[PDB]
Design a protein around this ligand. Sequence first.
Ligand SMILES: CCCCCCCCCCCCCC(=O)OC[C@H](COP(=O)([O-])OCC[N+](C)(C)C)OC(=O)CCCCCCCCCCCCC
Ligand SMILES: *C/C=C(C)/C=C/C=C(C)/C=C/C1=C(C)CCCC1(C)C
Length: 227
Amino acid sequence: TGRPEWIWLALGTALMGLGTLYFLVKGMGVSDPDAKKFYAITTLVPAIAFTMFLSMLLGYGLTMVPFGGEQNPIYWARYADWLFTTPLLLLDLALLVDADQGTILALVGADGIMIGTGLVGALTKVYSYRFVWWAISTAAMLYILYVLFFGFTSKAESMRPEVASTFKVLRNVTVVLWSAYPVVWLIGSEGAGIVPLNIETLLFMVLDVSAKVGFGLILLRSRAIFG
Ligand SMILES: CCCCCCCCCCCCCC(=O)OC[C@H](COP(=O)([O-])OCC[N+](C)(C)C)OC(=O)CCCCCCCCCCCCC
Ligand SMILES: *C/C=C(C)/C=C/C=C(C)/C=C/C1=C(C)CCCC1(C)C
């Protein structure tokens, strides 16, 4: 009966599910208050992803948008996942380096703009204006990456070296993974239409699992989260 990207939505669901269960069991077993905060934020991340992957697998979160002369499938539920999960990831990073309150507000604001303007782009009917929204979104993304690379690293230098070195691995993972998203959007079913929907779903699933479960495994096994 159903669409060919179903298999990657199914594999996504299973990996986000097992990662959530694993983080939950390890988290409930620790007593340190600082570690526990990291566990709570980091378990919630793949939990939200699991629910959105499951919804899309069962045929929700999907709409048709007319552009370029034809009717194009667009998965909007992805944006509902990212709207909450991307700022939770940034909060992990900010807590790890003791970032200022004003910095966090600015980053979460920027992140909201990135996801909101990405979604507006995805839903826009005049082909060339899709890319105006994409460009605004990518600018907001680049501001985030600049602040993580220059501002957060400088804050990390005032921490003990094992905290600084955990931050640097997470930072490097984040910059590499996050910088690929605007490229997948540009060339896939939301932008140019070159890479088909099934392969695009495969790419976003690998990126998402790496950015959430991978990131999580690295953070939650470090000594850096302990009080
Ligand atoms: C990360 C941020 C960096 C990117 C920022 C700028 C990059 C340089 C892009 C400029 C190229 C476009 C200029 C052009 O060349 O001509 C103008 C083009 C004609 O468009 P129009 O005749 O429909 O009316 C438009 C008139 N109006 C807007 C009032 C309705 O202005 C447009 O629309 C607007 C489309 C341009 C903005 C989005 C850039 C395209 C990005 C990549 C596209 C990739 C293709 C695979
Ligand atoms: C768990 C999900 C993660 C870590 C997702 C990150 C998603 C982005 C960095 C998305 C960025 C986008 C742009 C830069 C422009 C166009 C569309 C967006 C949402 C895909």
